[PDB]
Amino acid sequence: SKQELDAALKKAKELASSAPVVVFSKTYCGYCNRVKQLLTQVGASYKVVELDELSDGSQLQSALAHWTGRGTVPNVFIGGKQIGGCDTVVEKHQRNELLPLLQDAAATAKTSAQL
Ligand X SMILES: N[C@@H](CCC(=O)N[C@@H](CS)C(=O)NCC(=O)O)C(=O)O
Q: Is 87 annotated as a binding residue?
A: yes
Task: Give the contact letters, 42-61, x = binds to a second copy (CB under 8 A), - = no.
Answer: ------x-x-x--------x
Q: Which residue is nearest to ligand X (CB)?
A: 85
In the region spanning residues 3 to 32, those forming contacts with ligand FES, defined by CB under 6 A, are 29-31
Q: How far is the CB of 8 from ligand FES (least distance, A)?
A: 22
Q: How far is the CB of 113 from ligand X (least distance, A)?
A: 35
Among 68, 80, 90, 106, the residue binding a second copy under the rule CB under 8 A is 68
Residue 69's identity, in one-letter code, is: G
**Cβ count near 11 (within 10 Å):** 15
Contacts 24+ apart (CB under 8 A), 5-14: 5/59, 5/63, 8/56, 8/59, 8/60, 8/62, 8/63, 9/63, 9/66, 9/67, 11/56, 11/60, 11/63, 12/60, 12/63, 12/64, 12/67, 13/67
Binding site per annotation, positions for [2Fe-2S] cluster: 29
Q: Which residues bind ligand FES (CB under 6 A)?
A: 29-31
